[PDB]
Structure 1
Amino acid sequence: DIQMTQSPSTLSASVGDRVTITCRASQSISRWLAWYQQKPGKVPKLLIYKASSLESGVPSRFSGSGSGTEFTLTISSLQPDDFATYYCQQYNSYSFGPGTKVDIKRTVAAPSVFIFPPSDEQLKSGTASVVCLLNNFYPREAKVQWKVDNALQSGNSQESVTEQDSKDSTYSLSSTLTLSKADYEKHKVYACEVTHQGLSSPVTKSFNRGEC
């Protein structure tokens, strides 16, 4: 049934640029494609339908053209209020395409890594969380790896990312490592190794059990 996909997945742009987003649909969809703008915590808003026709009140700077298997959406002037995700949906079978999130382009800033041991309060409860914070950076792609002793490289973590900040437009990230109290005190160096393109070697923040 129709499979619809989008390029780019993501986009950095700055206010003024004309950007273009693409929507490909594996079987002719003819004209029957539409486009939605969504900002997190708001409802989807129909921008174009019947491949070209804008709704009432959409600003003339959005447009659409396409023909049956390839469909495109252009903003001529990005204004600081079109940074959101855009989705396309086809109307033979109502499958939406994956989305395209646009973010505000900005200079690289390499994050500041801060690491936090288990509190002894948490440890009474019989478990241990080690938090590593990468604070304030751009671009969004920056990886984190965990090591506990020599190098036991650990696979069992959860990262979470804030939205692009409204003043500086960086992102921050967390990675919690969770061990029970028994494997925690059965190890000694604990390391958070950050890689981000604005760093020329990867930073390792580390700490040793007991002697904090």
Structure 2
Amino acid sequence: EIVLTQSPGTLSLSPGETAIISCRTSQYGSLAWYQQRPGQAPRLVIYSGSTRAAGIPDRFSGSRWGPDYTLTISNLESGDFGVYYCQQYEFFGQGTKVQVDIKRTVAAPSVFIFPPSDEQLKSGTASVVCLLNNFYPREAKVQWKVDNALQSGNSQESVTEQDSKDSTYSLSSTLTLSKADYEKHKVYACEVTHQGLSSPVTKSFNRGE
């Protein structure tokens, strides 16, 4: 059948810059590109390789280059941002997310860690939070360690939109598990990686304050 490898998964740009999305196909049929903005219906951008659909400006362009179809969007406007998909027959690419970013100086995240409250611990559950506040760029990695042991699956991340005034990002990470499990261990820590940090910063706690 047809497989459609789309890349990159995410793309962070500012107005006026150019986006380059690609799509590798196993077949050679008619490829099309769609744009889907949040809370809006997807819209045909390009079809049959390089032909623009109705209304679409000339800054959108596609190239027929190899088994690799590419979509170029030059001089990005605010309306050009969203999630783009390539399509061949009934098959779709995994989707590329093109989101706005406003260029500003680099800023290291202030890192805070929050132990579980007592009220929650009386519900057989314990949540541990690791806040990354006011940093740039947005790309950051949080990594939980409990008694020197790396965690996976038991954490969920959440990010805010870019702030209007100071052009920064904040990020939360919630390590969730059962009270029984929580009590078994002593040390809890989240490790933060970021361009604004020379080395990975760590925040941690035990139960003794």
TM-score category, normalised to shorter length:
0.7 to 0.9
Structure 2 match to 1:9 = 9
Of 41-50 and 155-164, the range deviating more from structure 2: 155-164
SS across alignment from 1:172: strand
Instruction: Give the 3 Å change call, closer, same or farther, for CA 163–73 of structure 1 in structure 2.
Output: farther
How far off is 1:68 after superposition? 7.1
Instruction: Give the 3 Å change call, closer, same or farther, for CA 6–170 of structure 1 in structure 2.
Output: farther
Contact 1:33 1:90 in 2 (8 A): yes
Residue number among 79, 82, 103 corresponding to 2:80 in the alignment:
82
Structure 2 match to 1:103 = 99
SS across alignment from 1:27: coil
Contact 1:146 1:154 in 2 (8 A): yes
Letter in 1 for 2:96: T
State how many pairs are aligned: 206
Instruction: Give the 3 Å change call, closer, same or farther, for CA 28–143 of structure 1 in structure 2.
Output: same
Contact 1:61 1:76 in 2 (8 A): yes
Instruction: Give the 3 Å change call, closer, same or farther, for CA 170–98 of structure 1 in structure 2.
Output: farther
Q: Deviations over 1:90-127 (max 9, x none)?
A: 13xx2111222223343433222221111111111122
Instruction: Give the 3 Å change call, closer, same or farther, for CA 18–192 of structure 1 in structure 2.
Output: closer
* Cα distance in 2 between the residues matched to 1:77 and 1:192: 39
Q: Deviations over 1:12-63 (max 9, x none)?
A: 322212333222211222xx11111112332211111122332222223212
Structure 1 match to 2:43 = 45
Q: Deviations over 1:130-164 (max 9, x none)?
A: 11122233334322222333x23333422223254
Structure 2 match to 1:178 = 176
Instruction: Give the 3 Å change call, closer, same or farther, for CA 41–170 of structure 1 in structure 2.
Output: farther
Structure 1: tracts of 5 or more residues without a match: none
How far off is 1:67 after superposition? 5.8
Contact 2:146 2:187 in 1 (8 A): yes
* Cα distance in 1 between the residues matched to 2:4 and 2:186: 50
Instruction: Give the 3 Å change call, closer, same or farther, for CA 72–148 of structure 1 in structure 2.
Output: closer
* Cα distance in 1 between the residues matched to 2:193 and 2:59: 38
Contact 2:160 2:171 in 1 (8 A): no
Contact 2:116 2:128 in 1 (8 A): yes
Structure 2 match to 1:66 = 64
1:1-212 → structure 2 map (5 Å cutoff) = 1-29=1-29, 32-66=30-64, 69-91=67-89, 94-105=90-101, 106-107=103-104, 108-149=106-147, 151-162=148-159, 164-165=161-162, 167=164, 169-209=167-207, 211-212=208-209
SS across alignment from 1:63: strand
Contact 1:156 1:177 in 2 (8 A): no
Percent same amino acid at aligned positions?
A: 68
Contact 1:159 1:173 in 2 (8 A): no
TM-score, structure 2 as length reference? 0.85
